[PDB]
Design a protein around this ligand. Structure first.
Ligand code: MG
Ligand code: MG
Ligand code: MG
Ligand code: MG
Lengths: 434, 434, 434, 434
């Protein structure tokens, strides 16, 4: 299928865009052009050079100067931006520490997530309007965090938009379950996709209430697995939890499973931000890490060095699967192979007992021009109470951001499970973070 | 996967049971036993002998004398019975003709559909209580008509039951569309499965609002197709609409398409009973047939002869795929595959603007011990008005049956599109049919 | 309370306007001005003249030539128009007779109701825009039929409108029940207001599921009353059902009660148009009348002579209570009393199992700048089925009118219980009336 | 109306019991008997003796020793109990202080409310079964706290029960508003009931979003009132906030009003427990009191002395109105005078965006054998978020207490706005309070 046009917003991205370049370079099902748009033209142009050195020539990349130009005639829109700068992020993630509040990531919920979301609203409002004006029939795939707020803003501003949010966190839990099947049953699992899960919740706080490998029910096995490794934790093969800030021993997941009876389906570093527990103040004991801003600064600098190397040497990205589903979803949407995978979309009943329209993560059936959520049922009662509460806050942030009502955003702030400090301290903190 | 147990209610069946046997005999994924139960033990016994002459010895068949014995330890329950005798049906289908009302099938809606549903209610209440008592955790596949009422009674009497209703009408529309692709585009379609349709409605009144073959949108093509063959009709390769009471030239489907803008997705003979039209009074002009009860008595008699033939020649069923999805669905339910196919289930949002709990037909994602409806959107407004109306009637019939409230059943009777006679004529007709 | 401003759209009226003038001229709680608007300026003028010969000069009347002028600074907007002329109405009501369709009133449902609705849509869309632009904060009282459609158009076009539909039909059944108390119990009833009823449904198809007079439950009593007079009918004291086309012996209401078990709460002449029955073709057996358009023409001519009589003698209307609740609702809306009375308003749960947003009739609590519906429960099942079906047609008419979609209008026409003819006869009929 | 029977559960009361006796003795609209039940039969007997010296002998009182005897043939059931004892309550209210958590009342939300709820659940389950068994048609009026949880349990255990919860808190805010009209307008207000408020929320956390005195809008006036007296607070005529643990200067309400823009409608001492604020830590700054359990024990001893005084003096209660609406509501339910007043009932739409079935407080229209909530619209967004959260907790408690699930009760405990401590601290506290 030729002459596909993909518009890429955040096209100077050194993460999602690269990962998309790799997968495009190996899918023989498709060809076309990628319009790269970034507030920072310099980064977009380096991606144009790197992309045009990747794979066949199957995909032609172009750094473009405006949104309108990127979207014109686009069939797919990909969005992967950073709402603000590393300096903003420093505040997002670390300022609350002066009040005793710790955050492992800060891009989804808690104080960081609330404030980052406010900052993201007008960015997404503006993108929704551009997509409405220039490519209203395109499918939009959002990678940006906080994911529930960004995606929801897309639908508040352009009600008829065809948009999904994509996240890779559930994939990590499927891998965990694939290795468990081997360790507990001695049987090999070809691909993590073969771990068939009924996953539901909201981004970074998803839960698996049924799971199987072929004819085998995985829940009772996860029961024993969790019981055996609850204290020690469990490390993936060839990994140690201290290898990087992204690694863990799944102690937080095991602990949540004991309490709620569903399998937590995101990394420990994400799960820990959604509810009360000793996790965030004793990460070493719980065998995961917080991600500090020094890490992000360092990582940015070595991605920059990598980028400059690739150019100097006139190389493209590895022609190697990233493990993402972005290109698979795009192929599915174009009618080149149907797919059932987890996505974030407005709730119309696919998760029971949660507000309708709220952005929820579930399996969906994806085929030509169609993303169709699958009814996935109910969360455990305790998790549902927590999810309703976070959705409350997320809806308020999206509204607060569109109408510029800081009073309402502060209500959300005060309603967040991590903001457990006196009201006047929180107000000073909130105002300082704005 | 071995030692699976299927309970078959209506196990003397000479339609669905045979098709199930053929499909079982060629699937190498599974093996176990089929308990055949039927009020008429003689027929079940004959299916037992034909069954045990079919395939590899993969499946062992046993005719059993009671429901309890069929159900105990059952993993799957299939239901394919006739609610009443063919003598009862002669009344369902032909008596209203004295008041000028013709029916082509009379097993779904109209006067015969209503009376028939009424009769089926206490049969399925009893089946539901037995499944609850002996096989609470089995999956139940219902094939019996009136589909929406029977299936609904299962859930009303056993709210926790795991039941779907299955029908093959949508397959016939998929085959029609595959042939249209070949005729309009000149390209082959290898399987009717490759016609990926978004289908929705209630049984025998299903509609396709989106459809594709690979990258191609089929809806614009069906519009051309319909304009070209609207008058003359269109006949499947190597067929003539006169060949049997089951055949047509799709004139009714083309006519409904022009009116409603979605593709009607059942045979003309079924569609014709759901709405006002010239159809039922001029079936030969509309190029389809009515099915008189004599045809069914005749068909049954030649099926009886065929059955005696196989018993004499000590042969089993044809080891040939039936075209049905029953066995594929069972395999998916056991975790031996995953499948997206159309089924009947309680509405929890998969069809918009239709009462919740009512039995609707949509695609559903099926995997180990999971049937999960796919959100399929809205019908055309005209179609949705009719469907809400029939659903009203179906709900009232189910209630009327469980509470023996003939007054309420008469209200449904009166609300049926085919009953356009004075109220006293209808009351007299209704009482005669009871 | 003084300097109230009321805008009257349709103020050339000779029904509601005159009746309003009476009620206004005797309420001591209020004073202000009435801006009379009417396509026919001359007739608005004559109400001006006659209004200004009424009351104390408590109310100053003024004919105004434009909506905008009328609406400016209005606290209350009253709408009482005739959608089209009496000649149009001759078509609505009598043309269908050629196909054997009879109508008693034809301003609400049936073929005449549908066509009249279509006609009234653009007229109400226009009024809705004016109110939005010139008097968004006013309370709006609609008296025009077809009530459910007109009022719904108001909300569809101006979502934030504060609008109710008012009808006097229920008062008639309250009067009936008041006479029944006297006849069955010997005790006097001071006012029909004291018959405290739980009323619900849609305009002209309202039902009373609970009723009382002080401590006495009227349902069991109506049951006896109904049993005793079902065959003979019951005529109001000092009345004979033949006195006028508005009179009846309640035989239809008794018949509907026996079937459904709630008290129908509109005149037989309206009820008879909503469901199948022998009523319309045997009006004398059922002791009610059809209203031919010749009667409306005669009636209008005398009202016109009366008009000119008053103008010639410098006389106004009579200072006498009309029996309506209009002025009393206005007073309650201004804070000068509070009130619980029946109104038509969008459904938000006040009637169970009926679509939301559909215009339904229930009791509401009315107070300063507030009309708040009272949860009234469910209709009997057969009645709910009928009402859902009418609501369906009504929504379809509203949409059809707003988008100019005759195709949709015809679907509603086809779905109307009074339209029991062949489709092609109905098509010809529909086009002839359009 | 004579021979009415009222069952009083908790008929040993020295609070709601006495207030009822007073009000009964002055209402000449009614006559009958009161069956007094109380786990402490001697306390019920004393109310019998005191009761049978009260009124004209309008009401005869009888202490009965079983629920059966109390309930059988009852028209009205009143429930006014203390769930557990004053020692249990000492734990509810004061134990959490060891963790830095203060509570002003502890009978509604927070840790004490959650624990008291668990205690009340089985008591109300037992009462609901008895009412189902012996007086299914009675109207049930609940006064017991925790009110939301207590009333809900009645409906969970006996779904067809006819029950409301009654509380007097909103009356206090109507007085405030009455005195405000006089102070700000100089004009007098005859009755707190003339302050006509649109009130909604959950018990002890109700809000008034519209309010008036006749033609005057009270909200703009409360805005000025609140803005003037926000710092000083405002004391009622002839009152000083220090006068008793029940008084305040409305500083908390004024503060909530500035933040949310709706008039909070419960005393400061209840409001304080529902959200984060500095209120409970600086009560003296905010001009309200906490209620120590030592005060409750002293109050109980003085009530025991008054009881003995009345007996010895063979005096009944005073023939003086209590200010409650209890007897008024009873009269209305018997058909003796319709009434619009605030009650707690399952949510079916009367409050927007709040789960259905949940016990919510709004106006209802009460008449013969009918309590019909009035649609009251939405809370301010920030208040709705808090109420949904508290409702989540109340539903968890109702279930946990029935099904015994301390796991679920603990999630509710952790989701309560007053429990802002480490999870292991919370678990130790929670376990201790069990
Ligand atoms: Mg993520
Ligand atoms: Mg079928
Ligand atoms: Mg009317
Ligand atoms: Mg209270």
């Amino acid at each position: 299928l030729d002459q596909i046009k993909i518009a890429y917003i955040g096209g100077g991205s050194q993460g999602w865009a690269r990962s998309l370049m790799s997968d495009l370079s190996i899918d023989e099902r498709m060809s076309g052009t990628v319009a790269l748009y970034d507030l920072d033209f310099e980064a977009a142009q380096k991606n144009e050079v790197i992309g045009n050195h990747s794979g066949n020539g199957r995909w032609r990349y172009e750094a473009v100067s405006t949104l309108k130009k990127a979207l014109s005639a686009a069939d797919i829109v990909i969005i992967s931006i950073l709402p603000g700068s590393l300096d903003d992020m420093e505040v997002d993630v670390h300022l609350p520490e002066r009040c005793g509040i710790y955050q492992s990531v800060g891009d989804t919920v808690g104080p960081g997530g609330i404030i980052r979301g406010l900052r993201a609203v007008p960015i997404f409002a503006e993108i929704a309007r551009a997509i409405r004006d220039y490519a209203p029939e395109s499918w939009v795939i959002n990678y940006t965090n906080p994911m529930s707020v960004c995606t929801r803003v897309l639908y508040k501003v352009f009600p008829g938009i065809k948009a999904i949010g994509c996240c890779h966190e559930v994939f990590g839990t499927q891998k965990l379950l694939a290795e468990m099947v081997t360790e507990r049953l001695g049987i090999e699992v070809p691909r993590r996709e073969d771990i068939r899960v009924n996953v539901l919740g909201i981004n970074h706080f998803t839960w698996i209430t049924k799971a199987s490998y072929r004819h085998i029910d995985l829940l009772p096995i996860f029961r024993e697995f969790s019981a055996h490794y609850g204290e020690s934790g469990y490390e993936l093969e060839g990994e140690c939890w201290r290898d990087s800030v992204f690694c863990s021993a799944h102690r937080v997941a095991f602990d949540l499973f004991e309490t709620y009876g569903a399998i937590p389906a995101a990394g420990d570093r994400h799960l820990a931000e959604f509810l009360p527990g000793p996790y965030l103040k004793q990460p070493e004991v719980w065998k995961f890490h917080l991600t500090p801003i020094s890490f992000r600064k360092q990582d940015r600098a070595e991605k920059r060095q990598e980028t400059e190397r690739l150019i100097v040497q006139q190389r493209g990205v590895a022609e190697k699967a990233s493990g993402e589903e972005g290109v698979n979803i795009i192929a599915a949407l174009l009618g080149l192979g149907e797919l059932v995978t987890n996505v974030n979309m407005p709730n119309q009943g696919q998760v029971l007992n949660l507000p309708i329209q709220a952005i929820v993560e579930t399996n969906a059936f994806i085929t030509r021009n169609r993303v169709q959520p699958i009814l996935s049922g109910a969360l455990p009662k305790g998790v549902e109470m927590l999810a309703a509460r976070h959705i409350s806050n997320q809806e308020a942030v999206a509204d607060a951001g569109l109408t510029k009502d800081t009073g309402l955003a502060f209500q959300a702030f005060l309603n967040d499970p991590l903001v457990q400090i006196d009201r006047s301290d929180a107000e000073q903190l909130f105002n300082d973070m704005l």
